[PDB]
Structures are given as structure tokens and as C-alpha cells.
Design a protein around this ligand. Structure first.
Ligand code: HEM
Ligand SMILES: Cc1ccccc1C1=NN(C(=O)c2ccncc2)C(C)(C)C1
Length: 432
């Protein structure tokens, strides 16, 4: 009743889009456990996301913390909602995301991208159906495992099928809650994931002791954040957090980019030409190469406008506040959605047209209407990691292969924690 005065109704993101267009920039939604208010003006985006006065709503992030009673992300970097506890771990883990840290990861990006293209090239007979969704998730997972944790998962070669199963069941579990044996499959998968964590951490600890060669990475920092903690729960929260966050969205963004580009032959021809000019035949992209893939950068940004895997974020409004002429009561989750704003014609001209030129030099940058990595203090710690890795993978594909989507494959979305292609992006391939 306390929310009844707010405009609202008497893939869910698409329903939210319809509601925002019909009811304006502040709309009550009663889908989540609570009533929340979707705020879609750039004025609100700027006010709430760009200030440390506003923090994440813990009632919303509880669904990441714990799933069917099993600790999943716990109080890790994504799901910790208290500013001070968040800040303490952010500053330590930030060390793994410096320019100097990221530059050293180019080797791993190159090796796994090369392995993926060699695998695809062998199937490029213009006939064999290849799930690009699957191949890209395996590459993303193999990259993350090696880069962040020093482990070789070999999913690209069919290894670690249980591990991929567990991630899949746990993602479905997030959405399920947000019978008998689905609960079992989910619960086990989460424990599996945490048990993997304890394994690698034990391995890392063994290596360090008789001082084997142990290169500084994300794991180094998450360990450092927990130095002198009372047990390993905080450590394993971040293991799982980075295990999942460090591949799932990257994979999704890759899959969506490949899917969309399969109907964009003129953009594909421009991307192929850019890659031919900047890297040529070289089998390795350097760091300075990446910055020269300017058109590719723009394409990837446009892909994230229309297809953000992580569609938005929540903040807690503590005190009753006027928001764009609406009285929003205190103790209210505010939902921000780059998916919704990306598809509104008040913010983007012809919003459904895929146009990389929106992100060209000399184009007015979108002011608070576009945030696929979020904004402010709680923006994506892995944004530059992701940007580098997806560029490497995309550049290698474009260098070497032509993709055609199998007819019958759809362009629609599903929701499994994140947004991802409904279909497996089944393609036939030919060498360039
Ligand atoms: C295209 C790929 C990626 C996208 C679209 C993405 C998107 C996002 C978004 C929207 C948030 C804010 C979440 C919220 O408000 O609840 C976020 C935060 C985060 N992302 Fe990502 N992410 C990507 C890749 C990565 C990678 C590669 C890593 C790690 C290797 C990562 C780790 C995180 C973490 C740990 C946070 C929490 C940051 C904090 O609150 O301090 N993400 N990301
Ligand atoms: C944050 C978010 C908002 C809206 C909808 C979904 C998500 C998720 N992000 N996720 C990540 O792993 C992730 C988080 C941050 N950077 C990269 C990946 C899931 C836990 C899978 C779900």
C-alpha cells in the first residue's frame, strides 16, 4: 500500500522496458521478493550510482549470497553491501587489475584464443554445426582459470565436464529461487564449486611453501585480503565470485556479439579489414595492437548497449526521496537497468538498429544512459580484463574464420542469472 501511489502496472527486462515507456522514469514493480522501483532517467543514474552515499540493497543481493541454503557468493566483492567491508577488499584486489598486472595476461589471452581458432578452423567445412555459445564459454572459462588462478582447466578439449555442469546448475539455481532433486542438483553444484576453491587454494599454499614458482594473480590478492582471517569462508566467497564472474558475462557478451554480427555482413567486412590492417598475419596481438582495433571497440560497445549480460544493479534508498517528481518512500530498492535505457528511443535514436558509429570519435558519448559495467564505486573491477580478453578472442576469430548462423537459430534472449542468447548460436564456419 505504501507504494500504491507510484506509477506502474495494475524476458522480464522486456516487460520492464514496456513499463518504463508506458509509465515513465519511476515505476513500481512487484516481481522480486520485495516491491522495487525502477529508475530510468540519466539524472537518477548519475545521482545514485555516482555517489558513495548510496550502497547496494542487501535484500536484493541475498540471492547471490546463499542459494537454497548453501553459501555461494557469500560476502565476496560483488555481494558484500556494506561500504566499509566492501572497500577493504576492493583496495587489496585492485592491485591485480593495474595496467602492469593486466598487460602480463596478454599471453594467456593469446594462447587460449589461438587454441579456440585452431579448433574451429578444423571444423570450417561450411556444414558442421558448431555451438558458438559452448565454444566461447569454454574459452572464457579456460582463460579465467589460468589467468586468475594459475590452473589449466582444458574445457576446450572436453575436460572438466562436471565442473561446467556445476556452473550451469548453479546459474539456473540463482534464477529458480529469485523440486526435490532440482534442489539436490543445485545444492551439490554449489558445494562442488566451493570444494574446487579449497582444492586450488591448498595447491597454491603447497607451491608457496617449498617456494615453487608462483606468479602473482587475482588469487594472490584474494588470499592477501584474508591475511589473518579466522577461517577460509571469506577466501572461498571470493574464489567462487571471481571463478564465476570472471567468465560468465564475458562468454555471454562474446556469444551475443557473434550472434548479432552473423546478420551484419558489412560491419563484419569492416572488422575483418581492420584486423588485416592492424595485426596482418601475426598470430599474436600485443597490448598496443588492442588500442588500434578502434572499430572493433565500437562494435563491442554497441553489442553491450543492446545485449548487456549484467542488465543492471540495485541501490537502497534509505530516506523518502522525490525522484523525477515521484515520492519514493524510504527503505526501497532502486533498480537501474542499462538494458531498458539502451532500448528507449528517448535515449538512443532508432534503438533497435545496431550502429557502431554511436561510439565513434566525435560522437557525443552517452551521458548516464549506458552502463554495461555499471558506474561509480561499485562498477566492474574486471572491466578492462574483460575488454582486453574479448577483443583478443574476437580479433582472432575475425582474422581466420567466416561464420553463418544456422537457419532456425534465434536472436532472442533468455535469463539465467545473466542475459544470454536463447539458442546456442549454432554456426557453420569457413576459413577466411
Ligand atoms: C563483459 C564482461 C563483464 C561484464 C559485462 C561485467 C559487468 C559487471 C557489472 C554490471 C557489475 C556491477 C554489478 C552490480 O552492481 O551488482 C560488475 C561488477 C563486478 N564484476 Fe564484472 N563484468 C564483466 C567481466 C568481469 C570480469 C572479467 C571479472 C573478473 C575477472 C568481473 C568481476 C566483477 C566483480 C568482482 C564485480 C564486483 C565489483 C565491486 O563491487 O567492487 N567482471 N561487473
Ligand atoms: C551482477 C548482475 C546483475 C544483473 C543480473 C545478473 C548479474 C550477475 N552477474 N553475475 C556474474 O557472475 C558477474 C558479476 C560481475 N561481473 C561479471 C559477472 C552473475 C552472478 C552470474 C549474475
Amino acid at each position: 500500500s505504501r507504494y500504491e501511489h507510484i506509477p506502474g502496472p495494475p524476458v522480464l527486462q522486456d516487460v520492464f522496458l514496456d513499463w518504463a515507456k508506458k509509465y515513465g522514469p519511476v515505476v513500481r514493480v512487484n516481481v522480486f521478493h520485495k516491491t522495487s522501483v525502477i529508475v530510468t532517467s540519466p539524472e537518477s543514474v548519475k545521482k545514485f550510482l555516482m555517489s558513495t552515499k548510496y550502497n547496494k540493497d542487501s535484500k536484493m543481493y541475498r540471492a547471490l549470497q546463499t542459494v537454497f541454503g548453501e553459501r555461494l557468493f557469500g560476502q565476496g566483492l560483488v555481494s558484500e553491501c556494506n561500504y566499509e567491508r566492501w572497500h577493504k577488499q576492493r583496495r587489496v584486489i585492485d592491485l591485480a587489475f593495474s595496467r602492469s598486472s593486466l598487460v602480463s595476461l596478454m599471453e594467456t589471452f593469446n594462447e587460449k584464443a589461438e587454441q579456440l581458432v585452431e579448433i574451429l578452423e578444423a571444423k570450417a567445412d561450411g556444414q558442421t554445426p558448431v555451438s558458438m555459445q559452448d565454444m566461447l564459454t569454454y574459452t572464457a572459462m579456460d582463460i579465467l582459470a589460468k589467468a586468475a588462478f594459475g590452473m589449466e582447466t582444458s574445457m576446450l578439449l572436453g575436460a572438466q565436464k562436471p565442473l561446467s555442469q556445476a556452473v550451469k546448475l548453479m546459474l539456473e539455481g540463482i534464477t529458480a529461487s529469485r523440486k526435490r532433486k532440482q534442489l539436490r542438483e543445485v545444492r551439490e553444484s554449489i558445494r562442488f564449486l566451493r570444494q574446487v576453491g579449497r582444492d586450488w587454494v591448498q595447491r597454491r599454499r603447497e607451491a608457496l611453501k617449498r617456494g615453487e614458482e608462483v606468479p602473482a594473480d587475482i588469487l594472490t590478492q584474494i588470499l592477501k585480503a584474508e591475511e589473518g582471517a579466522q577461517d577460509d569462508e571469506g577466501l572461498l566467497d571470493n574464489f567462487v565470485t571471481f571463478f564465476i564472474a570472471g567468465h560468465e558475462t564475458s562468454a555471454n557478451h562474446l556469444a551475443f556479439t557473434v550472434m548479432e554480427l552473423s546478420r551484419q555482413p558489412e560491419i563484419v567486412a569492416r572488422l575483418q579489414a581492420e584486423v588485416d590492417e592492424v595485426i596482418g598475419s601475426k598470430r599474436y596481438l600485443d597490448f598496443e595492437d588492442l588500442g588500434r582495433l578502434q572499430y572493433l571497440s565500437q562494435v563491442l560497445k554497441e553489442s553491450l548497449r543492446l545485449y548487456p549480460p549484467a542488465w543492471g544493479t540495485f541501490r537502497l534508498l534509505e530516506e523518502e526521496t522525490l525522484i523525477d517528481g515521484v515520492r519514493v518512500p524510504g527503505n526501497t530498492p532502486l533498480l537501474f537497468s542499462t538494458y531498458v535505457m539502451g532500448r528507449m528511443d528517448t535515449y538512443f535514436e532508432d534503438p533497435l538498429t545496431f550502429n557502431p558509429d554511436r561510439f565513434g570519435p566525435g560522437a557525443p558519448k552517452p551521458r548516464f544512459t549506458y552502463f554495461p559495467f555499471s558506474l561509480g564505486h561499485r562498477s566492474c573491477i574486471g572491466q578492462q580484463f574483460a575488454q582486453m580478453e574479448v577483443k583478443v578472442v574476437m580479433a582472432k576469430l575475425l582474422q581466420r574464420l567466416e561464420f553463418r548462423l544456422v537457419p532456425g537459430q534465434r536472436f532472442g534472449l533468455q535469463e539465467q542469472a545473466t542475459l544470454k542468447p536463447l539458442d546456442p548460436v549454432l554456426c557453420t564456419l569457413r576459413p577466411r
